[PDB]
Amino acid sequence: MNHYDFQGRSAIITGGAQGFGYAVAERLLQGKAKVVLWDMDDKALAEARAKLEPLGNVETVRVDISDQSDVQQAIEATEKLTQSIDILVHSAGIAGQNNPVADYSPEEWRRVIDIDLNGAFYVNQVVVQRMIAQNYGRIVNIASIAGKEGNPTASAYSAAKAGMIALTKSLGKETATRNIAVNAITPAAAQILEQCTQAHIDYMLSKIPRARFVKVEELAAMVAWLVSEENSFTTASVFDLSGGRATY
Ligand SMILES: NC(=O)c1ccc[n+]([C@@H]2O[C@H](COP(=O)([O-])OP(=O)(O)OC[C@H]3O[C@@H](n4cnc5c(N)ncnc54)[C@H](O)[C@@H]3O)[C@@H](O)[C@H]2O)c1
């Protein structure tokens, strides 16, 4: 096992109460970062803080990242809890319902874009402002393989994740002359997936050459390096976690 140092650094992790964000918070606490969990569910946040407290110092902020005003209230509350805001791992988002474009609900389309794309912009804006003021920052926007490939019957989700990738490329080059790294990750499906049929699971696994889904352990390990100081050159890039499926 590697060790990523985070002493003196503070991190914001949206969607940190469970799943990918929780696994990243668990690893950043091993690097002894100060972790602030952003999530919409106040109940899940309370269970996360209870599990993670024996691992280190953790704070929680209730916020809907698709509401820009709630994001503005969240970043100010976080400033009262930290000395600086050094790391952002944007993991909040929904999967959206599955439907062909010909049948997709306009309301569901707008809901997916607001949460998975507009929300990512709101969070990235207020956090990078602090990173600019301190001339330090590391950002990882957790996208998806769907953003690269355009999965059939998931157009809204795929379109939202592709915007997050372009947002990442744009924001990265805007801050390239500063000590700020802005990158994204395109993971495959994770072990959310239990609502699927077995035949549907066999189809998803047939597109992944490793024949298995990514473990939250493996995502958190790669995120931990991407938000460390040693990631001092690569920015506006996409790091893959698809197990051999992606071709670019
Ligand atoms: N798990 C997968 O198979 C998979 C695959 C590819 C990409 N992703 C992406 O990774 C992210 C989440 O992954 P996960 O496995 O941890 O899902 P999850 O359901 O286990 O957790 C998602 C968390 O984000 C929160 N959330 C949703 N909308 C929110 C909002 N407006 N404001 C604040 N919090 C909100 C949720 O409360 C939850 O805590 C998403 O961006 C997802 O698109 C997941």
Give 143 Cα–ligand 1 centroid separation in angstroms. Answer: 10
Q: At what angle do helices 68-79 and 119-134 cross, to 10 degrees?
A: 30
Residue 47 CB–ligand 1 contact under 6 Å: no
Tokens of 181: 């790294």
CA distance 247 to 229: 29
Q: Which technique was used to obtain these atomic coordinates?
A: X-ray
How far apart (Å, rounded) are the C-alpha atoms in residues 127 and 114? 18
CB 14 within 8 A of CB 21: yes
157 catalytic? Reply is yes
- Whether the CB of 42 sits within 6 Å of ligand 1: no
Question: Which of 94, 98, 118 most suits a substitution to test ligand 1, by most atoms within 8 Å of the C-beta?
Answer: 94
Going from the C-alpha of 148 to that of each of 17, 104, 115, 143, the distances in angstroms are 27, 20, 19, 9
Take atom 27 of ligand 1 and give the residue whose Cα is closest: 93
Instruction: Point out the ligand 1 atom lying closest to the alpha carbon of residue 115.
Output: 31
Question: Can you list the domains of the chain with their CATH numbers?
Answer: 10-241 (3.40.50.720)
Nearest of 80, 171, 72, 181 to residue 136 by alpha carbon: 181
Amino acid letter at 239?
F
> What is the resolution of the experimental data for this entry, in Å?
2.5
